[PDB]
Ligand binder design. Structure first.
Ligand SMILES: CCCCNc1cc(C(=O)O)cc(S(N)(=O)=O)c1Oc1ccccc1
Ligand SMILES: CCCCNc1cc(C(=O)O)cc(S(N)(=O)=O)c1Oc1ccccc1
Ligand SMILES: [Cl-]
Ligand SMILES: [Cl-]
Ligand SMILES: [K+]
Ligand SMILES: [K+]
Lengths: 871, 871
């Protein structure tokens, strides 16, 4: 409260409201200003990741992959898939150990890492991918059970339909077991893991246990010549190495099935890393070991038959089959019985109890399917909670004591059932495999992008993640999805890009500190730094304007006109000076900053809103002109709206306005004054005095823009009579060397001539309330009144400023007579000597010159060399 | 002078000094502050471009190209080469019509368009390319003359040596005619052009004039069946279409041979466009017309022999040769006499007088060689004048009334002679052809890059150049140089990149308004705009610091320390407040801006120097804090050096320093104070009060950098006794959730305890000269002295600030006892209530706390939520 307090965790909690009644930080103004189920890492992320990786391939098609591709090359396949998977694991660990991750899985990580765009895109893709991987795992189980009940005669319908029936029944059962909370299905996956490990152990023991009954088959029991033969990549008619990797890689996916449970984990940012990485390690070790064992234990082909005798007749027999026995030897002529390349149930028979390995297949398939079916709706409901796609505002309610996406479970069940009864899993497989690849690629790109933008808030807790390995992982994921069904990769990239576009044009109104935001800041900073090293030059001058807008709403069309000759060229800083007590005005600026900056961005005003606190408008603008900008983006021109209200405004205010003029001149700023009717085809430019070229550059830049592109830029000047043609030719060659594509140059000799009586008497009537009438009251009352500036010095300030006023009024008359048909007028701003002219008289000059006309820009330049005709 | 003057061309002339005595612009301060041979376009750029394009191919190898590739495909070849050439012509015209081009050619255009890097690189490449194209043209003439003097028996030596002899003699003659001024060689090219056009006319007339003597040859005189046959692309054993285009394209090059004479043209920016484009038009028309005529007039092969009788025996004769006559019919069996595909002198014989066409070949070759030999040294001497490569500071003197590169002429003559006597022009041809391609590519990229950066000074006088056609031209040049000898294109790209690197690491100290500079500004502006649309978030906070450096030289290691936790992360604005009269201080700021900004860039300080003019340091820094920055790059922290001199400084100055502290607090700025020994392994952080997380973020960012990466970040806090273990565990979990990888957390209970007598008496002695001794002089003298702030209120300001001082001194003692071994110390900055504490007492607090210690950062934060453990 009154005294500063020691730091506590309570200060930084709930980020909007988290126990705010206790441990609330004291504000700087207060000190200064004077007066329900959660899973551990073992059973929540280790078991689930391990149990999701282990699927159909481990027990069915692995003997095939090690049989065709050689042992030394099948291990290469496994190692490449594991490099991709492990690099993605490090990336996921880096993302997960950054903050506290609320709910969902890969979606939440990627979204909160680098923006709702990639977040929503890849989250939707991953939710679909897991929802259908449910169907893939369950139909693998269907193939297993139908093979078992076709080898054992009893069957009900044709295989292509019995698979559908059994898959539908068991996916219904999977929904039932999953929809009943997560303690129950957690224990269910525990018992499935026990069964799976029993199957692995049975295979290992049986592989160490050879027998003569299986001798006719490829089973021989660790014979060295079998290993020597199987090292080679003995392929088949069609399957190439890339196709082999394509077959295997689905077995590599399934990691971060615990990360998808991040919403229900007891302690993320400590369970995700050492659960996912350790699960990948264990599963890869098991794959490699079992592959080398089965390759070293069984042979390619075996004419399994007792009639195949081990008598071993003395023949050449170059094949190493007869090296063990004449049985299962020399069957290459016709398609012999079975073997690694000719059978799949090798895994079953090399082991001991065939049931204890069959149960391995069922447990692996069910466990992987159940893990995917739990993971998909968590991701989906996290995605729907953020309402990136408002169409799915449902699927996020999550009925139950622990938020469980019942609707998400039903939706993923329907999707899985639909893809089961489609029964075309073979053709859909590459699409979904490289959806998984796309998700992994965006995770590694998540880490790389986060490390690329410095972002002091990046700072993850988990080391071992360096940026280049993550970039390599993204590249490898892209290359692998090219390897797997190139056109599927193109389709996946199209889907990603389409969702990206959809989200970036939706622009969900949400902010969670993307790495994209950090990169934006860092990029803008780096280019400002490189600009700071770029020396100035005439033909790279830009009108970079501080515009005393006030509130940017107050003068809209003025803002548009300035934006016209500053869009995509030069700077535009909309300055607004705030007033009054410091404490209240801090909050005033804080809200106006957001409001007006968003208003500019919404209205495509590439401008910069700069609020300052100051005692009055003059020294607030002094603040702005002195300090606004960054590097060589500091303003060089001050833009004002003509203070139309001076006849009614307090004369101190208009004096402040004129001293603003004078300050801008004093600190080497060009001044532009815009007088237009704000209630809401030639550009006429009367640039009678060489301001330095700015009075040319403004209309030319206006002609550059599309709005004024179809409008001539005819020019007027003043010159002595009898030299009219000479002056016009010199003017034409002068600005033809400036490449200002004029349309008609007019030369006026009527300047410096006494204007009509009506106009002079009108100006005298206007100035009468402020000319101080310095006739009587010689010095005492005269000096007493002059103790405040804003009166015109009758005698003193109308001696030569008499002809100054005459030129002003006559110029106004000339703009009436000649340029009244212009779409826009740009004319030299009159300059009065500092202190020599009463501010009232100078404002009267501006009124007299600028009144009753189309839009006017009274441009006076820095008197530098703004334009050039060199190169 | 005193009065503003009408604009005149004299104001913008010579850009440093050009008739400055007459027509000198009046300065804004003055108004405001109170008190020898030149060539026209016909003979300088039209004749030269036309006469350089027309070379060997027109009269020697063109019959070959139209004979092998079909008429409808030879015209396609010519049209593609002309598309490349004409797009480059539009680009060159756009570049040349921008400013006034001093001297040189393509070098000056490209350099002054987009920087000395591409300028010097491509200028050197083009100078070499023209220097050796001299050799190519002259050896073509050598082949012509040796063929003429071998058909006419008299010969001197073997052809491979007679060509060398005649080429050497005639290149010596070419030097002689070129080294004798440009009026003489201009008239020489005039007469060569007359000869060439006579040859063209003779060919046309002879082609309209058929005869029986040439009837046995391919000459038949516009027979329709000959045209119908020749439309097809009847190629040969080896020559493919791409090879054909490779042969032709050297004939397309040679444009901007007048642009290389830009230094000696009477009026560039009006001669270059309508000379180069018209010359390309005329030459392409002549190529196309002569190609179609010779294709429609002669046949592929002709067994030229009177014995070949036109008797026309009644045979099949599918070939259209016999359609005209049995002569020159059916010779395909063996290699028959000659023809389009079997002879080159067809051009000579289809015409009338063979001498009047032979003279055509000699005139074309000599004229092209002479044009190249004039153009190369102009480019070279322009390149050497800018001293981009200081090694060639010679070759630029240019002796003569008109600056003529005598040394350049000699150098190009030596290069041409060397490549003549090498006599390996066939193998070097693709290298030089795609050097020409590279130069054209950089010209089109010149225009595209210039149009890409808005740059109000771009604005060329010549329309018809839109940016996308120039980009297409650059792409086409790149593709064509791939077509011509791919590895030659790779070598050319390597040479370009190498010269680019050499120049960009040389960094010649010169500024001529590159388009690269404009692009740098525009890119930085665009990314600042996109940053302006990026909403704030806690975990994207950056310490973006306004550092009251003063002169950045004054405190170097302080600048380095701030740069350490701001490099590549957050902003760093080195503010310096200037003093005194406005007029002198304007120039002061103007010179200091350049000096200090260059000093920062040189010393790899990615900082921003911000000078302001102000009455005193306090309100200058007020200017800076209120207004510095752009968009969301405004500073959020104020960094000060501890005013070490306060014991000697005027007490008003240190009061100003403390009110600077207070202003920074008032406008919601965190404050960092650095006290280190500026005369010139654990980071200890004692962050006793929850500033909002900045006191953690600073040392962590220090640990991020390489300099401090190997240094622990151990932390100290204060806590009540009997809760030491609880407080330490809570602290550890708190900043482990903040991922600040601490090394040892220490908890101190000795805080809030009365420190030793020696330290308290030392502090009392220090504060004695300013405690105002408010014992006597009850109110009158007391209030009179208190009419100025900087004295300590003895009675009032030492009631509870007594225990404040006690904590300050005891904390100092503790830093001595514990953290004196640190490499750096970061501690909470004490905050005093505004106006409640005398500024002298607060400065004494800072002295007492910070004295006699390693580098200290007294960090006090905004009291916002700088750190977070969410995501
Ligand atoms: C992203 C992976 C989705 C699951 N698909 C899958 C998983 C595993 C495994 O073991 O995890 C093995 C294979 S497989 N038959 O070896 O290619 C798989 O492909 C299938 C499975 C059945 C139907 C169609 C395709
Ligand atoms: C960049 C072009 C340099 C000049 N080389 C050149 C010009 C012309 C032409 O007519 O301007 C025609 C040919 S050619 N024989 O048709 O390919 C040329 O190639 C040569 C010539 C002679 C020796 C070796 C190569
Ligand atoms: Cl996965
Ligand atoms: Cl050229
Ligand atoms: K799997
Ligand atoms: K040529």
């Amino acid at each position: 409260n009154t005294m500063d307090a020691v730091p506590r965790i309570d200060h930084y909690r709930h980020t909007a409201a988290q126990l705010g009644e206790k441990l609330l930080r004291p504000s700087l103004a207060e000190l200064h200003d004077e007066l329900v189920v959660k899973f551990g890492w073992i059973n929540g992320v280790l078991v689930r990741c391990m149990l999701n990786i282990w699927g159909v391939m481990l027990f069915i098609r692995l003997s095939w992959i090690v049989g065709q591709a050689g042992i030394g090359l099948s291990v290469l396949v496994i190692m490449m898939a594991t490099v991709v998977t492990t690099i993605t694991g490090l990336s996921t660990s880096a993302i997960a150990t950054n903050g506290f991750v609320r709910g969902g899985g890969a979606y939440y990580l990627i979204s909160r890492s680098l923006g709702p765009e990639f977040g929503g895109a890849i989250g939707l893709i991953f939710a679909f991918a897991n929802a259908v991987a449910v169907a893939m795992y369950v139909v693998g189980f269907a193939e297993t059970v139908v093979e078992l009940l076709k080898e054992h005669s009893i069957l009900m319908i044709d295989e292509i339909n019995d698979i559908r029936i059994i898959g539908a029944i068991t996916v219904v059962i999977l929904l039932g077991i999953s929809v009943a909370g997560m303690e129950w299905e957690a224990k269910a996956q525990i018992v499935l893991l026990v069964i799976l490990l029993l199957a692995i152990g049975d295979f290992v023991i049986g592989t160490f246990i050879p027998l003569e009954s299986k001798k006719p088959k490829g089973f021989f029991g660790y014979k060295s010549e079998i290993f020597n033969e199987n090292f080679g990549p003995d392929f088949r008619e069609e399957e190439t190495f890339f196709s082999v990797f394509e077959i295997f890689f689905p077995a590599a996916t399934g990691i971060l099935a615990g990360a998808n449970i991040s919403g229900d984990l007891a302690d993320p940012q400590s369970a995700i890393p050492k659960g996912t990485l350790l699960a990948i390690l264990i599963t890869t070790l098991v794959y490699v070991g079992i592959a080398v064992s089965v390759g070293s234990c069984v042979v390619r082909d075996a004419t399994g038959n007792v009639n195949d005798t081990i008598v071993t007749e003395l023949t050449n027999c170059t094949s190493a089959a007869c090296k063990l026995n004449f049985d299962f030897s020399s069957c290459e002529s016709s398609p012999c019985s079975y073997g690694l390349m000719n059978n799949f149930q090798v895994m079953s028979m090399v082991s001991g109890f065939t049931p204890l390995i069959s149960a391995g297949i069922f447990s692996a398939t069910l466990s992987s399917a159940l893990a995917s079916l739990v993971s998909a709706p968590k991701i989906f409901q996290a995605l729907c909670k953020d309402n990136i796609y408002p169409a799915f505002q449902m699927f996020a309610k999550g009925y139950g004591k622990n938020n469980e996406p019942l609707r998400g479970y039903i939706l993923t069940f329907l999707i899985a059932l639909g893809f089961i009864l489609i029964a075309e899993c073979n053709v859909i497989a590459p699409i979904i495999s490289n959806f998984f690849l796309a998700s992994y690629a965006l995770i590694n790109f998540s880490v790389f992008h986060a490390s690329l933008a410095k972002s002091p808030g990046w700072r993850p807790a988990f080391k071992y993640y360096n940026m280049w390995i993550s970039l390599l992982g993204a590249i490898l994921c892209c290359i692998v999805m090219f390897v797997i069904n190139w056109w599927a990769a193109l389709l996946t990239y199209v889907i990603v890009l389409g969702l990206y576009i959809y989200v970036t044009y939706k622009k969900p109104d949400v902010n969670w500190g993307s790495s994209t935001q950090a990169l934006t800041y860092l990029n803008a900073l780096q280019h400002s730094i490189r600009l700071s090293g770029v020396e100035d030059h005439v033909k790279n001058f830009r009108p970079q304007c501080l515009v005393m807008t006030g509130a940017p709403n107050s003068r809209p069309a003025l803002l548009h006109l300035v934006h016209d000759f500053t869009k995509n060229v030069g700077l535009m800083i909309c300055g607004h000076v705030h007033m009054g007590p410091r404490r209240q005005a801090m909050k005033e600026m804080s809200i106006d900053q957001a409001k007006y900056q968003r208003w500019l961005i919404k209205n495509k005003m590439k401008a910069f809103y700069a609020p300052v606190h100051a005692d009055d408008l003059r020294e607030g603008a002094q603040y702005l002109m002195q300090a606004a900008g960054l590097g060589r983006m500091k303003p060089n021109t001050l833009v004002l709206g003509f203070k139309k209200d001076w006849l009614q405004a307090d004369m101190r205010d208009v004096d402040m306005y004129i001293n603003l003029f004078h300050d801008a001149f004093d600190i080497q700023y060009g001044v532009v004054v815009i007088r237009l009717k704000e209630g809401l085809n030639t550009i006429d430019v009367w640039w009678l005095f060489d301001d330095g070229g700015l009075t040319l550059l403004i209309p030319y830049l206006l002609t550059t823009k599309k709005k004024w592109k179809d409008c001539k830029i005819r020019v007027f000047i003043g010159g002595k009579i009898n030299r009219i043609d000479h002056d016009r030719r010199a003017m034409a060659t002068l600005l033809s060397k400036f490449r200002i594509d004029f349309s008609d140059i007019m030369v006026l000799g009527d300047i410096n001539t006494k204007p009509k009586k009506e106009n002079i008497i009108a100006f005298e009537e206007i100035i009468e309330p402020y000319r101080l009438h310095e006739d009587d009251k010689e010095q005492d009352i005269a000096d007493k009144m002059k103790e405040d500036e804003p009166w015109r010095i009758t005698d003193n300030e109308l001696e030569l400023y008499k002809t100054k006023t005459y030129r002003q009024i006559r110029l106004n008359e000339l703009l009436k007579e000649h340029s009244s048909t212009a779409n826009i007028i740009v004319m030299s701003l009159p300059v009065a000597r500092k202190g020599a002219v009463s501010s009232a008289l100078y404002m009267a000059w501006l009124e007299a010159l600028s009144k009753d006309l189309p839009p006017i820009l009274l441009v006076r330049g820095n008197h530098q060399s703004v334009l050039t005709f060199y190169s």
